[PDB]
Design a protein around this nucleic acid. Structure first.
Lengths: 89, 274, 43
RNA sequence: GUAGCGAAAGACGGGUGAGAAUCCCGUCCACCGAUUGACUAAGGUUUCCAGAGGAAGGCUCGUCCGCUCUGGGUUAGUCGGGUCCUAAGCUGAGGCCGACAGGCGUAGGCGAUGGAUAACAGGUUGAUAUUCCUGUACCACCUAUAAUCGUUUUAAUCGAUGGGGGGACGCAGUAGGAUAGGCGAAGCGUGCGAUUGGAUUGCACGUCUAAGCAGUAAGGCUGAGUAUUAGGCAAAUCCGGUACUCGUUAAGGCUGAGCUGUGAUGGGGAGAAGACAUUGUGUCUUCGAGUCGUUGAUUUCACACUGCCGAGAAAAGCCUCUAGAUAGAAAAUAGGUGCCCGUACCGCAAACCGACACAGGUAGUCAAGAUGAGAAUUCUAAGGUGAGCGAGCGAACUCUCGUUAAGGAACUCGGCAAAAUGACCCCGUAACUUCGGGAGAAGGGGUGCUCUUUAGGGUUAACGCCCAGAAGAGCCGCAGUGAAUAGGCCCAAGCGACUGUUUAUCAAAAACACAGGUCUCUGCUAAACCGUAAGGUGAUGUAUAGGGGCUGACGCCUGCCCGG
């Protein structure tokens, strides 16, 4: 743990408008809580977290050439650290 | 007394009611109440077994002391009260230590009156005694069939039974039906007649009032079809085309007796009617 | 005008549904049938 | 190349484009308006937002789309749910019954549609917001902080698997007391018309949350204190009976109580344009512009009070008191810490149920102005929409609508349908009645505008401010509730007493119910009924009760036959 509950960052215009502030958006494991998320980012990036909000996204239906299905459900977190930065690109 | 309403409405023409004058407290005691949900004539299988029971006004159950065990501790009558679960009114009494109970209200009971239970007690209205210690000739109510179980006979409005004699360990007693019976001399009973005597004189006036009291309608067999009743059928109005009137479940219902033989009480009964 | 099947998720999953089928021996038989037939959904 | 293209007002200009009645923008016009409006549940499940697209779908077209492709979008200590309580019901170890399967049932457990429970204003996106940002608060847990109880029995506090109170409740009606909304006007802001006239003259405006300081408008109170104990499975300093002192005063002693004034906030935004070089001058970096004053006032105080019978949940949270418990807690500060699920979008519908982008159905909340008793009626703000095939001609026939000379039911099974009546005020009104009624009986009459007033509801201060007390005097018209909306009436026979209910989808009735009668059964493990039984209903009822049969308000009555 502490490096497997965080999987990917999210890069969008909204996430970048957030990164203009101290807000950073991640995609995490579907079974973990915001407390685990906070402890994990503090352990990894060596920063101090203020708040962490979180949401669950449903599976989206998809089609591709007579083969329909569902995407994977995903859990998104938004952390709002007090001071510090993260060298993303 | 009984009040007659004026005939402002065709549903109020010949309709009567009670005054509720002998009621002196129109609010019950919080502690002696329990819930009473409606069964609507439906058993543990959820099936309708008795007809004509349904949804009337909501009620709470007043817990009554039919067994007058509190011996040697006189109690003072605190109030008379209305009971929806019953035709007779009830009396809230308070014992010397503060324990309070409900009893059935007899005819000539009054607030402040004193009432006691036991063999040492005296023959006054409201008092409970064993039948051994009650003298012959007097009227009683709330009689036990088995000692310590509680009153089962003479509980309704205006009900009374009178002692007639004394056997070895039994006493002869005459009931409101005209039946005489043998009751154990240890079985308890209360002195006096039950109150609310005018309860039998009300004219209910309108169907909605029966619906409030929880009576659904009854529909006659002669206007059913044959698959539903023995009297069903006929091209128009028809008479009872059988030798005897019959129930909906295929049994005689006029004059045929239904008590079953080989009961223990068959010998304790000496003269019976109805 | 009013039509049959006024849907309800709770009642659907309560009168149908896996636990309700498994609560009775005959409801355990419809599952065995759907498994044997190869049904993708059992409840 | 026929029937049909699913209720409804569109017109023009400009633009985009290969291509336009159908797409975008603009002006005008029109429609819904107790709704074609705005929210919230259920249900649906990405239909949401940007770009791109015209093969298929769209009842035409299509540059458009709830369609296709690509990529994005749902942020909570306080919102609704679970970590709380229980109702009906469902399961139910032991246990009962039973060919098997299995059925029932005790403690218990599960279970909201109920109870308990801490957050408000402003800003901001293409798409979320009481969730993000700002500000100001509130509610719990933990840790340090130290003045207070200092055997720890007791003690504020710990305190029961303990107790008592409370939560905790119906229906209708009445009266008030505040408040949202709403309102005349010179506080003050604002711009002055072009077709004649006028210039107090047109039109508007006057604000603002949760929380915390003070009090408060009325409501309830055998209202305050002493003594004792057959009790609260054991304990109690709390509950209950009784004997006394101030006694029915309500001072204000007491619990509860709508709401009001300062700060919150000289912050926000502000009828503002005066601020632009720009942000297409739309907008905004800068600096103020009213927080005045009358009239009448849903919801809330609380089922408060009053009355009525049909006599109107439970448990927990909570409040007090406890034997035993422990040093020993607290609070008031400062720190921290506050998990999980949902949140997009449609939502009285093009996304739900209906085979459909179906004239149907779908629980709840809010709902302005004029007219009026009114949520009726007609028009209209705000908001939403112009409805998803069109252009012409104005034949027969069919449907919907209006008007028709003379006559007036002659039509027809039948005055079916249509016509007529219709509001408010006044005058008057029969038979017959169970004395309630009938009765809105029938039948007549009146209603506009202007000036006088003597004067009523008074706006009342008073004629003025609205209706008038409504009395006179006038004016106009074919017509004065000038539109819309708003009872046809009488006489006499049957049936059924009445209100009600009935064949979802050809029968709403004289058929069923009914309240009242009567007969019969049943002495309580009652009879009766369900079930193989166990267990249940009847009934936590007990002959003034319960079941069954017939009859069917009320009044006068209810005859003969017991041979079968």
């Amino acid at each position: 743990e502490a490096r497997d509950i965080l999987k990917r960052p999210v890069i969008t215009e909204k996430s970048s408008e957030a990164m203009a502030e101290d807000k950073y958006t991640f995609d995490v494991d579907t079974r973990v809580n915001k407390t685990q998320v906070k402890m994990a980012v503090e352990e990894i990036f060596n920063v101090k977290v203020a708040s962490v909000n979180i949401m669950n996204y449903k599976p989206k239906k998809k089609r591709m050439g007579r083969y329909q299905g569902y995407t994977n459900k995903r859990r998104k977190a938004i952390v709002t650290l007090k001071e510090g930065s993260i060298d993303l690109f | 007394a009984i009040k007659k309403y004026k005939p402002i409405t065709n549903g109020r023409r010949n309709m009567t009611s009670l005054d509720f004058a002998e009621i002196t407290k129109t609010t019950p005691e919080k502690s002696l109440l329990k819930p009473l949900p409606k069964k609507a004539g439906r058993n543990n299988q959820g099936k309708l077994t008795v007809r004509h029971h349904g949804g009337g006004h909501k009620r709470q159950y007043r817990v009554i002391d039919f067994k007058r065990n509190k011996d040697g501790i006189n109690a003072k009558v605190d109030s008379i009260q209305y009971d929806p679960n019953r035709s007779a009114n009830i009396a809230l009494v308070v014992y010397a230590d503060g324990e309070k109970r409900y009893i059935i209200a007899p005819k000539g009971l009054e607030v402040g009156q004193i009432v006691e239970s036991g063999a040492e007690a005296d023959i006054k209205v409201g008092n409970a005694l064993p039948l051994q210690n009650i003298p012959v000739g007097t009227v009683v109510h709330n009689i036990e069939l088995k000692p310590g179980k509680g009153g089962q006979i003479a509980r309704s409005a205006g009900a009374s039974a009178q002692v007639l004699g004394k056997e070895g360990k039994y006493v002869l007693i005459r009931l409101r039906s005209g039946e005489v019976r043998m009751i154990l001399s240890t079985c308890r009973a209360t002195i006096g007649q039950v109150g609310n005597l005018q309860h039998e004189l009300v004219n209910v006036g309108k169907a909605g009032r029966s619906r409030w009291k929880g009576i659904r309608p009854t529909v006659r067999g002669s206007v059913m079809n044959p698959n539903d009743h023995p009297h069903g059928g006929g091209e128009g109005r028809a008479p009872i085309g059988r030798p005897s009137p019959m129930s909906p479940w295929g049994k005689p219902t006029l004059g045929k007796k239904t008590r079953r033989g080989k009961k223990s009480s068959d010998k304790l009964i000496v003269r019976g009617r109805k | 005008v009013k039509r049959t099947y006024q849907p309800n998720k709770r009642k659907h999953s309560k009168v149908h549904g896996f636990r309700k089928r498994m609560s009775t021996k005959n409801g355990r038989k419809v599952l065995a049938r759907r498994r044997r037939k190869g049904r993708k959904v059992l409840s």
